[PDB]
Amino acid sequence: DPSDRLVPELDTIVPLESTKAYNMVDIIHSVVDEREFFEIMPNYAKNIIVGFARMNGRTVGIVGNQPKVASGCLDINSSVKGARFVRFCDAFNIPLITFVDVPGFLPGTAQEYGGIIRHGAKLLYAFAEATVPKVTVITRKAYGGAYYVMSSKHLCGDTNYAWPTAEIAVMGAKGAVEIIFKGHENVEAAQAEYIEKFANPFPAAVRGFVDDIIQPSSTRARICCDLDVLASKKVQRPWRKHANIPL
Amino acid sequence: YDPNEKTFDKILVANRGEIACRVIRTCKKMGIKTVAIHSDVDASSVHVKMADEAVCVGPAPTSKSYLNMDAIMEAIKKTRAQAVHPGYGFLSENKEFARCLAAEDVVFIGPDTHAIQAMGDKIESKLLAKKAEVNTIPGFDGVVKDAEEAVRIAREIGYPVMIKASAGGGGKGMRIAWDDEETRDGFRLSSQEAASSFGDDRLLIEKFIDNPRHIEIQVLGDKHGNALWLNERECSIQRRNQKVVEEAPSIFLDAETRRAMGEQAVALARAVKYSSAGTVEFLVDSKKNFYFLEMNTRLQVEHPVTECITGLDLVQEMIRVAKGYPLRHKQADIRINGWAVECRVYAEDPYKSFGLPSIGRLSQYQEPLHLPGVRVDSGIQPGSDISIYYDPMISKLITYGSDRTEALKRMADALDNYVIRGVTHNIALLREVIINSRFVKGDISTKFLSDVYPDGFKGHMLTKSEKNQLLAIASSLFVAFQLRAQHFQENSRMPVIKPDIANWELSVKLHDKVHTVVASNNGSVFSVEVDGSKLNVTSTWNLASPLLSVSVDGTQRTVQCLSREAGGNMSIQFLGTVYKVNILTRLAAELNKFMLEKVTEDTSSVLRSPMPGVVVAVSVKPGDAVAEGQEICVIEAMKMQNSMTAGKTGTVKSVHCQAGDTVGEGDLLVELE
Amino acid sequence: ATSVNERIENKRRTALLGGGQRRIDAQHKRGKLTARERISLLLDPGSFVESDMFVEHRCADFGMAADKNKFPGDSVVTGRGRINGRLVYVFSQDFTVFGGSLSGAHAQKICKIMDQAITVGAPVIGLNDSGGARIQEGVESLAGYADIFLRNVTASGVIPQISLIMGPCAGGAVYSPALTDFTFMVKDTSYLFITGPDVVKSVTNEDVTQEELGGAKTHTTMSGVAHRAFENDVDALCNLRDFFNYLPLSSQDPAPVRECH
Ligand SMILES: CCC(=O)SCCNC(=O)CCNC(=O)[C@H](O)C(C)(C)COP(=O)(O)OP(=O)(O)OC[C@H]1O[C@@H](n2cnc3c(N)ncnc32)[C@H](O)[C@@H]1OP(=O)(O)O
Ligand SMILES: Nc1ncnc2c1ncn2[C@@H]1O[C@H](COP(=O)(O)OP(=O)(O)OP(=O)(O)O)[C@@H](O)[C@H]1O
Ligand SMILES: *C(=O)CCCC[C@@H]1SC[C@@H]2NC(=O)N[C@@H]21
Ligand SMILES: [Mg+2]
């Protein structure tokens, strides 16, 4: 299986409007070697996908958001499911690949009473601790804290790319307009000017938060290349007996 | 392809798919700026990116995007277009489009409105043919208005009487009847179905020719009163009165019949004053008696195949004629060059109803363009999804050669080397049709698919030698996968000791039988003993390429591996048919004998809401029979709608929730069977 | 006449009064102390050393460039000090300036003090009172959060980290307390939730108030997020000093041994 294989079928898998959904497992199958993917916990907390695959014959760990199930939102179960998989992959020198399409954290009294804060911290900590190579690709959305929970550059990420349909924002364009232009209350033009500058990956790109805006069809050909370079990655951290996971 | 002559600078193509791609290609070959229309869904199709520029016409449905005349008019107005090509279908027969189009300076590339209105209706075409002193089906003249009239006419016009609703088309509104009671009941049924579908309410009743050959003559009329017949074609292989496999040089027909039919078609075209490309369909019986059926007044779909035996670009000649130039060819210049056979590859399941439309998204798509003598016409690229709004057809595959046998062999090779993954297609049907003994011999009628497979499409019944070849190939693939799994990079801390197993003793379960296989590996050679018979398999054993070529006992085979599980299940496409084989080791089979059967009943009758939210819409009601993949109740939740689907094929027992209702997580929404 | 010295004095007097006087009156009306009062209560008298006093936000969108939207300190007071003679780094979020919402400068100051603490090997105490993240600045604000979060994960098991929630805290400013070793809250004035009640009503369609969604009782009795709750800010800071006396300054140091009677 050549490492330079093109994947044109991913060039239009993301629907035009953010309202529709798509299957992330299709992207994962199109990207990995021979489309062979060993999914872990496939039936539990289905709004997140974790598994083992191969890139250029090297074992890799795949994490991603599933827009089909629960809109791709993060909750307690998905956070706990992802955190331990990431920790195991980091403990045994296995690279991590992340596909990001997440609108935010699931709200409600149930999530707060169950302690969504602790488990979201679990996932954030798991991604921040990793010293293995990590590659992130943002497909459609990254809003709120879920943006940097899902292996952002600011957690010592290695390479991050954005598809042309990426949407990186602090929070929803509307709610941002009313919270910023509260006195203006002229969303007719306020939203139009907001969706022209911030409803696009250009802000994070010009700040350098993403390395490059790549065509989807080159995804695999990029990732393999990165995994060939990052194989010698070594980082140093302050000494400690062990850290304090927020368990 | 002379570019010196002046021709229209701007052409708009009012179609989509393969035909739009073909017109764009032939316009680029002759130096014409092209315009392509497209709906919102098809905004990234092949013909849009191949065109110089494109104009969106409207929403997804064809009744609002490509059938919207006003959008086409404004698109032509803005783009300064000079000509328009309708391809086939859609507005190619629209008189209103023709008149509003001729209202301005732009010209319609095709036949005149007079021919369109003459041939749109069936009875007028039949009476014109009668006035054209050409052979026709003996049938009633006019429209039958009562069942009693139907039966009294059926007394004399023949016991095997066919009733056809006037106008319309597409294979509907046609039905065969035997008895007078059959005559009257078919009359009434045709009446209400024509009212519902066509709305014309006019019925044409005529004799049904038994076991006919659907021959077709391609004519190229011009503006100077010249008609040329471009040989013949055969479309006998039909499904629901829709053609699937075609052959340009018809073997049953001979030179004298060819000349007679060509002269008849030319005379009919001159009578109708046709001034573009078209086709005439005849039903040749056993005794070489043909009768006029329909003269298609547009670019016929099966046009490319005759090109392979003539060498003339039909679209180019249509454009040149529309300009006004005289025909550059003579009747004597037309001849037969080699052989050409083509098949239409649809996105349908051939196992059910001989092909029923399916939907999906194409994850993998590759055509055998590298194979010799193969032409592929397709508006399909990887990532293209098959929808319900349009014709569920993938591509058209044409093979040309010196003679019939070479063309059929190349067609079989091309079908074996065709990669489609994402939807279900009818490649198995086409390959079995081309390799059928009757098809090779030459005994074909319009009932080929019906009589050859009476109980339905079942798959390629493979013989003993073919079964041994398949088992050997599957076992060799299994052993190759194991050997690849044994290969690791050097560790230098815990060295790997590769096992020295020489013989692999496998149990291969196929269909229902179980076979014992002994496989041995020597380099790239696999010596496989299946039930005593010894075979040798050699290949490069590339486990990642979608197409794998092997050589079993000298015979070269091309197979695909569409699925593979660690349990032992494997789906392999061999000779066009997908076979499921379960491969285990002998010890694994002996231990599996103890395993108990797992009964799988499940529930799949309770639907749970993923989160609290407002159900945007519900498309089901209690008592709706639904299957897997169909959305049940789309729920809007936090600027995102989830189209939740049923787990199994069961009738909807109850829809507890309704549209515009707010629910919590895991509430009672839908109960199924 | 040199305007540099008078400018320095004016900027100092503006920093000590935060983002205004009527805002401070409103803060005290709700029973809440200001950030500098909290720092003064927490640390030993005459031991606070402030850092990044004049650091300013650099956003220039939606009118943030106007001097009316320019406040020295930028809604956070960071520095070092001593509790019972032992060194500790501290930051207090000033709700007066833009609701205490995070920005580039805010996160930079917090990250600077955290880096200094991990360099010398001293604990970090953070008094959280932040309405959220400055949304006019945009994506950069998120980066701030993430930077802070990274340092938390880097400091876990190296230096003790304590968080005291003394006001509303929503959005991404709920994960820094979660990543720290211990979290305390003040009753009836502190809130911890990812999304406010209005969003919950819009999405889940259930009407709740702030107190029952993220209040101290909720997070100390049925959520397991907070460790203790205190009646008011004075008692909370006294108990924080008492608790701080227990811990070692770093994982390299042994357990503190006192004099016993
Ligand atoms: C899609 C629908 C949406 O946009 S809802 C989610 C985002 N919209 C918001 O309003 C969230 C921020 N508003 C909030 O009230 C905060 O979440 C919380 C933590 C609850 C603050 O509680 P509370 O003590 O009642 O503040 P308040 O409303 O009385 O106003 C006081 C000052 O605080 C400020 N503040 C607060 N958060 C931010 C923020 N993220 N960015 C900028 N400023 C913030 C407010 O501007 C307000 O300023 P001022 O003193 O009224 O001039
Ligand atoms: N009089 C007839 N006797 C026997 N078979 C007939 C007769 N008329 C039609 N058929 C059968 O029906 C098939 C389709 O008929 P026909 O071409 O009229 O349909 P259609 O849907 O209008 O087609 P098209 O797309 O060419 O307009 C023919 O190929 C032939 O097999
Ligand atoms: C779109 O309407 C999303 C609304 C949910 C808000 C999410 S939740 C977590 C993030 N924190 C925040 O304040 N907004 C984001
Ligand atoms: Mg017809």
Side-chain angles (χ1 to χ4, degrees), chain B residues 137 162 164 169-171 174 206-209 212 214 238 241-243 281 283 293-294 298 446:
Chain B
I137 296 90
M162 183 278 288
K164 176 195 308 179
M174 294 182 286
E206 61 176 1
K207 180 64 182 62
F208 188 98
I209 314 299
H214 189 268
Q238 292 193 6
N241 320 301
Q242 287 295 316
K243 328 148 190 178
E281 309 183 359
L283 295 193
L293 188 153
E294 187 179 3
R298 51 159 177 72
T446 53

PDB file of all heavy atoms in Angstrom, chain B residues 137 162 164 169-171 174 206-209 212 214 238 241-243 281 283 293-294 298 446, ligand 2:
ATOM      1  N   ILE B 137     -46.569  -2.583 -37.990  1.00  0.00           N
ATOM      2  CA  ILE B 137     -47.337  -3.615 -37.285  1.00  0.00           C
ATOM      3  C   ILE B 137     -48.797  -3.535 -37.716  1.00  0.00           C
ATOM      4  O   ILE B 137     -49.397  -2.447 -37.662  1.00  0.00           O
ATOM      5  CB  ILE B 137     -47.209  -3.446 -35.769  1.00  0.00           C
ATOM      6  CG1 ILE B 137     -45.766  -3.645 -35.296  1.00  0.00           C
ATOM      7  CG2 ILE B 137     -48.146  -4.402 -35.055  1.00  0.00           C
ATOM      8  CD1 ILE B 137     -44.938  -2.385 -35.268  1.00  0.00           C
ATOM      9  N   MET B 162     -51.052  -6.384 -28.233  1.00  0.00           N
ATOM     10  CA  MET B 162     -50.336  -5.525 -27.300  1.00  0.00           C
ATOM     11  C   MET B 162     -51.021  -4.168 -27.239  1.00  0.00           C
ATOM     12  O   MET B 162     -51.314  -3.570 -28.280  1.00  0.00           O
ATOM     13  CB  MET B 162     -48.870  -5.371 -27.716  1.00  0.00           C
ATOM     14  CG  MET B 162     -48.007  -4.543 -26.767  1.00  0.00           C
ATOM     15  SD  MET B 162     -48.136  -2.757 -26.983  1.00  0.00           S
ATOM     16  CE  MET B 162     -47.257  -2.545 -28.526  1.00  0.00           C
ATOM     17  N   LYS B 164     -50.691  -0.276 -25.973  1.00  0.00           N
ATOM     18  CA  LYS B 164     -49.692   0.733 -25.647  1.00  0.00           C
ATOM     19  C   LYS B 164     -50.383   2.074 -25.472  1.00  0.00           C
ATOM     20  O   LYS B 164     -51.110   2.521 -26.365  1.00  0.00           O
ATOM     21  CB  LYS B 164     -48.624   0.824 -26.741  1.00  0.00           C
ATOM     22  CG  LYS B 164     -47.599   1.920 -26.519  1.00  0.00           C
ATOM     23  CD  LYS B 164     -46.810   2.201 -27.787  1.00  0.00           C
ATOM     24  CE  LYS B 164     -46.223   0.924 -28.363  1.00  0.00           C
ATOM     25  NZ  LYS B 164     -45.464   1.175 -29.618  1.00  0.00           N
ATOM     26  N   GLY B 169     -43.586   7.132 -22.690  1.00  0.00           N
ATOM     27  CA  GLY B 169     -42.450   6.287 -22.995  1.00  0.00           C
ATOM     28  C   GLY B 169     -41.761   5.768 -21.750  1.00  0.00           C
ATOM     29  O   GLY B 169     -42.385   5.657 -20.692  1.00  0.00           O
ATOM     30  N   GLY B 170     -40.477   5.444 -21.863  1.00  0.00           N
ATOM     31  CA  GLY B 170     -39.735   4.936 -20.729  1.00  0.00           C
ATOM     32  C   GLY B 170     -40.026   3.501 -20.358  1.00  0.00           C
ATOM     33  O   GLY B 170     -39.658   3.078 -19.256  1.00  0.00           O
ATOM     34  N   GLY B 171     -40.672   2.737 -21.236  1.00  0.00           N
ATOM     35  CA  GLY B 171     -41.012   1.362 -20.946  1.00  0.00           C
ATOM     36  C   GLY B 171     -42.323   1.163 -20.222  1.00  0.00           C
ATOM     37  O   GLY B 171     -42.705   0.011 -19.978  1.00  0.00           O
ATOM     38  N   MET B 174     -47.204  -0.158 -21.578  1.00  0.00           N
ATOM     39  CA  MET B 174     -47.222  -1.185 -22.610  1.00  0.00           C
ATOM     40  C   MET B 174     -47.481  -2.529 -21.952  1.00  0.00           C
ATOM     41  O   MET B 174     -46.817  -2.876 -20.971  1.00  0.00           O
ATOM     42  CB  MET B 174     -45.900  -1.222 -23.383  1.00  0.00           C
ATOM     43  CG  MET B 174     -45.630   0.018 -24.211  1.00  0.00           C
ATOM     44  SD  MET B 174     -44.095  -0.116 -25.141  1.00  0.00           S
ATOM     45  CE  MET B 174     -42.899   0.100 -23.827  1.00  0.00           C
ATOM     46  N   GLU B 206     -52.274  -2.776 -31.044  1.00  0.00           N
ATOM     47  CA  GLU B 206     -51.675  -3.347 -32.241  1.00  0.00           C
ATOM     48  C   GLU B 206     -51.195  -4.761 -31.944  1.00  0.00           C
ATOM     49  O   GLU B 206     -51.137  -5.195 -30.790  1.00  0.00           O
ATOM     50  CB  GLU B 206     -50.519  -2.481 -32.752  1.00  0.00           C
ATOM     51  CG  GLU B 206     -49.382  -2.321 -31.755  1.00  0.00           C
ATOM     52  CD  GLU B 206     -48.217  -1.532 -32.319  1.00  0.00           C
ATOM     53  OE1 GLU B 206     -48.301  -1.100 -33.488  1.00  0.00           O
ATOM     54  OE2 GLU B 206     -47.219  -1.344 -31.593  1.00  0.00           O
ATOM     55  N   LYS B 207     -50.855  -5.478 -33.013  1.00  0.00           N
ATOM     56  CA  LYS B 207     -50.355  -6.841 -32.887  1.00  0.00           C
ATOM     57  C   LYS B 207     -49.013  -6.861 -32.164  1.00  0.00           C
ATOM     58  O   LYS B 207     -48.174  -5.974 -32.348  1.00  0.00           O
ATOM     59  CB  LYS B 207     -50.216  -7.474 -34.271  1.00  0.00           C
ATOM     60  CG  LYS B 207     -49.709  -8.907 -34.267  1.00  0.00           C
ATOM     61  CD  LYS B 207     -50.685  -9.838 -33.573  1.00  0.00           C
ATOM     62  CE  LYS B 207     -50.150 -11.259 -33.527  1.00  0.00           C
ATOM     63  NZ  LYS B 207     -48.878 -11.349 -32.760  1.00  0.00           N
ATOM     64  N   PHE B 208     -48.813  -7.878 -31.331  1.00  0.00           N
ATOM     65  CA  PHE B 208     -47.543  -8.082 -30.644  1.00  0.00           C
ATOM     66  C   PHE B 208     -46.710  -9.066 -31.458  1.00  0.00           C
ATOM     67  O   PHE B 208     -47.123 -10.211 -31.670  1.00  0.00           O
ATOM     68  CB  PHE B 208     -47.768  -8.596 -29.225  1.00  0.00           C
ATOM     69  CG  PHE B 208     -46.516  -8.654 -28.391  1.00  0.00           C
ATOM     70  CD1 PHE B 208     -46.211  -7.632 -27.509  1.00  0.00           C
ATOM     71  CD2 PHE B 208     -45.656  -9.735 -28.477  1.00  0.00           C
ATOM     72  CE1 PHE B 208     -45.066  -7.681 -26.736  1.00  0.00           C
ATOM     73  CE2 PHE B 208     -44.509  -9.789 -27.709  1.00  0.00           C
ATOM     74  CZ  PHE B 208     -44.214  -8.761 -26.838  1.00  0.00           C
ATOM     75  N   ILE B 209     -45.537  -8.625 -31.911  1.00  0.00           N
ATOM     76  CA  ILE B 209     -44.645  -9.519 -32.636  1.00  0.00           C
ATOM     77  C   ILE B 209     -43.955 -10.444 -31.645  1.00  0.00           C
ATOM     78  O   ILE B 209     -43.340  -9.993 -30.671  1.00  0.00           O
ATOM     79  CB  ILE B 209     -43.629  -8.715 -33.459  1.00  0.00           C
ATOM     80  CG1 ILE B 209     -44.331  -7.582 -34.210  1.00  0.00           C
ATOM     81  CG2 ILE B 209     -42.901  -9.622 -34.434  1.00  0.00           C
ATOM     82  CD1 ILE B 209     -45.374  -8.060 -35.195  1.00  0.00           C
ATOM     83  N   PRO B 212     -39.231 -10.905 -31.045  1.00  0.00           N
ATOM     84  CA  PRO B 212     -38.596 -10.037 -32.035  1.00  0.00           C
ATOM     85  C   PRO B 212     -37.177  -9.655 -31.641  1.00  0.00           C
ATOM     86  O   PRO B 212     -36.757  -9.788 -30.490  1.00  0.00           O
ATOM     87  CB  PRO B 212     -39.509  -8.806 -32.031  1.00  0.00           C
ATOM     88  CG  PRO B 212     -39.946  -8.707 -30.607  1.00  0.00           C
ATOM     89  CD  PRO B 212     -39.977 -10.119 -30.045  1.00  0.00           C
ATOM     90  N   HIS B 214     -34.885  -6.325 -31.584  1.00  0.00           N
ATOM     91  CA  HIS B 214     -35.058  -4.880 -31.586  1.00  0.00           C
ATOM     92  C   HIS B 214     -33.921  -4.199 -32.332  1.00  0.00           C
ATOM     93  O   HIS B 214     -32.989  -3.674 -31.714  1.00  0.00           O
ATOM     94  CB  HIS B 214     -35.145  -4.359 -30.152  1.00  0.00           C
ATOM     95  CG  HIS B 214     -35.529  -2.918 -30.054  1.00  0.00           C
ATOM     96  ND1 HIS B 214     -34.599  -1.903 -29.998  1.00  0.00           N
ATOM     97  CD2 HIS B 214     -36.742  -2.320 -30.001  1.00  0.00           C
ATOM     98  CE1 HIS B 214     -35.223  -0.741 -29.913  1.00  0.00           C
ATOM     99  NE2 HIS B 214     -36.523  -0.967 -29.913  1.00  0.00           N
ATOM    100  N   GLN B 238     -33.030  -6.560 -23.143  1.00  0.00           N
ATOM    101  CA  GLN B 238     -33.818  -5.517 -22.505  1.00  0.00           C
ATOM    102  C   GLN B 238     -34.279  -5.969 -21.129  1.00  0.00           C
ATOM    103  O   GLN B 238     -34.424  -7.163 -20.858  1.00  0.00           O
ATOM    104  CB  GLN B 238     -35.040  -5.125 -23.344  1.00  0.00           C
ATOM    105  CG  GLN B 238     -34.701  -4.417 -24.641  1.00  0.00           C
ATOM    106  CD  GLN B 238     -35.913  -3.776 -25.280  1.00  0.00           C
ATOM    107  OE1 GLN B 238     -36.997  -3.763 -24.700  1.00  0.00           O
ATOM    108  NE2 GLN B 238     -35.737  -3.241 -26.481  1.00  0.00           N
ATOM    109  N   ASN B 241     -38.384  -3.474 -20.600  1.00  0.00           N
ATOM    110  CA  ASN B 241     -38.384  -2.735 -21.861  1.00  0.00           C
ATOM    111  C   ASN B 241     -37.372  -1.592 -21.833  1.00  0.00           C
ATOM    112  O   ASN B 241     -37.605  -0.515 -22.384  1.00  0.00           O
ATOM    113  CB  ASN B 241     -39.782  -2.218 -22.206  1.00  0.00           C
ATOM    114  CG  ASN B 241     -40.865  -3.223 -21.889  1.00  0.00           C
ATOM    115  OD1 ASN B 241     -40.867  -4.337 -22.414  1.00  0.00           O
ATOM    116  ND2 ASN B 241     -41.796  -2.838 -21.025  1.00  0.00           N
ATOM    117  N   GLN B 242     -36.237  -1.830 -21.180  1.00  0.00           N
ATOM    118  CA  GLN B 242     -35.128  -0.886 -21.177  1.00  0.00           C
ATOM    119  C   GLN B 242     -33.861  -1.641 -21.539  1.00  0.00           C
ATOM    120  O   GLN B 242     -33.578  -2.696 -20.966  1.00  0.00           O
ATOM    121  CB  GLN B 242     -34.979  -0.198 -19.817  1.00  0.00           C
ATOM    122  CG  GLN B 242     -36.062   0.826 -19.528  1.00  0.00           C
ATOM    123  CD  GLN B 242     -36.005   2.009 -20.472  1.00  0.00           C
ATOM    124  OE1 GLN B 242     -34.934   2.545 -20.749  1.00  0.00           O
ATOM    125  NE2 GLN B 242     -37.164   2.421 -20.972  1.00  0.00           N
ATOM    126  N   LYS B 243     -33.105  -1.098 -22.486  1.00  0.00           N
ATOM    127  CA  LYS B 243     -31.969  -1.805 -23.056  1.00  0.00           C
ATOM    128  C   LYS B 243     -30.742  -1.681 -22.160  1.00  0.00           C
ATOM    129  O   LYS B 243     -30.493  -0.630 -21.564  1.00  0.00           O
ATOM    130  CB  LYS B 243     -31.676  -1.256 -24.449  1.00  0.00           C
ATOM    131  CG  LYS B 243     -32.918  -0.785 -25.180  1.00  0.00           C
ATOM    132  CD  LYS B 243     -32.616   0.373 -26.110  1.00  0.00           C
ATOM    133  CE  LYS B 243     -33.897   0.987 -26.648  1.00  0.00           C
ATOM    134  NZ  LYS B 243     -33.636   2.156 -27.533  1.00  0.00           N
ATOM    135  N   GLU B 281     -36.401   2.493 -34.910  1.00  0.00           N
ATOM    136  CA  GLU B 281     -36.431   1.182 -34.275  1.00  0.00           C
ATOM    137  C   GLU B 281     -37.384   0.262 -35.025  1.00  0.00           C
ATOM    138  O   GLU B 281     -38.517   0.648 -35.329  1.00  0.00           O
ATOM    139  CB  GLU B 281     -36.847   1.292 -32.808  1.00  0.00           C
ATOM    140  CG  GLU B 281     -36.050   2.316 -32.016  1.00  0.00           C
ATOM    141  CD  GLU B 281     -36.428   2.345 -30.547  1.00  0.00           C
ATOM    142  OE1 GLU B 281     -37.323   1.572 -30.146  1.00  0.00           O
ATOM    143  OE2 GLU B 281     -35.833   3.146 -29.795  1.00  0.00           O
ATOM    144  N   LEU B 283     -38.689  -4.085 -35.337  1.00  0.00           N
ATOM    145  CA  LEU B 283     -38.787  -5.382 -34.676  1.00  0.00           C
ATOM    146  C   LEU B 283     -38.709  -6.455 -35.758  1.00  0.00           C
ATOM    147  O   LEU B 283     -39.700  -6.761 -36.422  1.00  0.00           O
ATOM    148  CB  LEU B 283     -40.072  -5.495 -33.869  1.00  0.00           C
ATOM    149  CG  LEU B 283     -40.208  -4.543 -32.682  1.00  0.00           C
ATOM    150  CD1 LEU B 283     -41.367  -4.961 -31.794  1.00  0.00           C
ATOM    151  CD2 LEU B 283     -38.915  -4.484 -31.889  1.00  0.00           C
ATOM    152  N   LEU B 293     -41.545   0.942 -35.281  1.00  0.00           N
ATOM    153  CA  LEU B 293     -41.994   1.064 -33.900  1.00  0.00           C
ATOM    154  C   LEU B 293     -41.937   2.502 -33.398  1.00  0.00           C
ATOM    155  O   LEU B 293     -42.946   3.033 -32.928  1.00  0.00           O
ATOM    156  CB  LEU B 293     -41.153   0.149 -32.997  1.00  0.00           C
ATOM    157  CG  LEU B 293     -41.543  -0.034 -31.526  1.00  0.00           C
ATOM    158  CD1 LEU B 293     -41.057  -1.382 -31.033  1.00  0.00           C
ATOM    159  CD2 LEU B 293     -40.965   1.062 -30.646  1.00  0.00           C
ATOM    160  N   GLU B 294     -40.772   3.139 -33.487  1.00  0.00           N
ATOM    161  CA  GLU B 294     -40.605   4.511 -33.032  1.00  0.00           C
ATOM    162  C   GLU B 294     -39.348   5.077 -33.672  1.00  0.00           C
ATOM    163  O   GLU B 294     -38.350   4.366 -33.814  1.00  0.00           O
ATOM    164  CB  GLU B 294     -40.504   4.582 -31.503  1.00  0.00           C
ATOM    165  CG  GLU B 294     -40.489   5.991 -30.932  1.00  0.00           C
ATOM    166  CD  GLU B 294     -40.407   6.004 -29.417  1.00  0.00           C
ATOM    167  OE1 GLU B 294     -40.301   4.915 -28.816  1.00  0.00           O
ATOM    168  OE2 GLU B 294     -40.452   7.103 -28.825  1.00  0.00           O
ATOM    169  N   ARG B 298     -33.889  12.463 -31.261  1.00  0.00           N
ATOM    170  CA  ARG B 298     -32.835  13.050 -30.438  1.00  0.00           C
ATOM    171  C   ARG B 298     -31.593  12.182 -30.585  1.00  0.00           C
ATOM    172  O   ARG B 298     -31.602  11.169 -31.290  1.00  0.00           O
ATOM    173  CB  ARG B 298     -33.256  13.166 -28.972  1.00  0.00           C
ATOM    174  CG  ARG B 298     -33.796  11.874 -28.397  1.00  0.00           C
ATOM    175  CD  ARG B 298     -33.725  11.848 -26.882  1.00  0.00           C
ATOM    176  NE  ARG B 298     -34.319  10.637 -26.329  1.00  0.00           N
ATOM    177  CZ  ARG B 298     -33.777   9.429 -26.404  1.00  0.00           C
ATOM    178  NH1 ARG B 298     -32.610   9.229 -26.995  1.00  0.00           N
ATOM    179  NH2 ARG B 298     -34.420   8.395 -25.870  1.00  0.00           N
ATOM    180  N   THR B 446     -36.029 -10.576 -27.454  1.00  0.00           N
ATOM    181  CA  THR B 446     -36.338  -9.620 -26.399  1.00  0.00           C
ATOM    182  C   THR B 446     -36.653 -10.289 -25.069  1.00  0.00           C
ATOM    183  O   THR B 446     -36.777  -9.591 -24.058  1.00  0.00           O
ATOM    184  CB  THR B 446     -37.517  -8.734 -26.807  1.00  0.00           C
ATOM    185  OG1 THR B 446     -38.622  -9.559 -27.193  1.00  0.00           O
ATOM    186  CG2 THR B 446     -37.130  -7.834 -27.966  1.00  0.00           C
TER     187      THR B 446
HETATM  188  N1  LIG D   2     -45.805  -4.089 -31.088  1.00  0.00           N
HETATM  189  C1  LIG D   2     -44.863  -4.650 -30.323  1.00  0.00           C
HETATM  190  N2  LIG D   2     -44.676  -5.986 -30.408  1.00  0.00           N
HETATM  191  C2  LIG D   2     -43.736  -6.552 -29.648  1.00  0.00           C
HETATM  192  N3  LIG D   2     -42.910  -5.978 -28.771  1.00  0.00           N
HETATM  193  C3  LIG D   2     -43.116  -4.659 -28.707  1.00  0.00           C
HETATM  194  C4  LIG D   2     -44.047  -3.930 -29.429  1.00  0.00           C
HETATM  195  N4  LIG D   2     -43.976  -2.583 -29.104  1.00  0.00           N
HETATM  196  C5  LIG D   2     -43.020  -2.532 -28.208  1.00  0.00           C
HETATM  197  N5  LIG D   2     -42.456  -3.747 -27.920  1.00  0.00           N
HETATM  198  C6  LIG D   2     -41.379  -4.017 -26.976  1.00  0.00           C
HETATM  199  O1  LIG D   2     -41.309  -2.938 -26.056  1.00  0.00           O
HETATM  200  C7  LIG D   2     -39.967  -2.409 -26.023  1.00  0.00           C
HETATM  201  C8  LIG D   2     -40.012  -0.932 -25.728  1.00  0.00           C
HETATM  202  O2  LIG D   2     -40.950  -0.302 -26.626  1.00  0.00           O
HETATM  203  P1  LIG D   2     -40.837   1.231 -26.980  1.00  0.00           P
HETATM  204  O3  LIG D   2     -39.593   1.507 -27.726  1.00  0.00           O
HETATM  205  O4  LIG D   2     -42.127   1.667 -27.671  1.00  0.00           O
HETATM  206  O5  LIG D   2     -40.818   1.924 -25.555  1.00  0.00           O
HETATM  207  P2  LIG D   2     -40.417   3.346 -24.963  1.00  0.00           P
HETATM  208  O6  LIG D   2     -40.412   3.357 -23.489  1.00  0.00           O
HETATM  209  O7  LIG D   2     -41.317   4.385 -25.630  1.00  0.00           O
HETATM  210  O8  LIG D   2     -38.963   3.538 -25.559  1.00  0.00           O
HETATM  211  P3  LIG D   2     -37.970   4.703 -25.993  1.00  0.00           P
HETATM  212  O9  LIG D   2     -37.041   5.040 -24.878  1.00  0.00           O
HETATM  213  O10 LIG D   2     -37.268   4.163 -27.243  1.00  0.00           O
HETATM  214  O11 LIG D   2     -38.893   5.859 -26.398  1.00  0.00           O
HETATM  215  C9  LIG D   2     -39.378  -2.783 -27.375  1.00  0.00           C
HETATM  216  O12 LIG D   2     -37.958  -2.845 -27.304  1.00  0.00           O
HETATM  217  C10 LIG D   2     -39.996  -4.159 -27.627  1.00  0.00           C
HETATM  218  O13 LIG D   2     -39.255  -5.197 -26.997  1.00  0.00           O
END
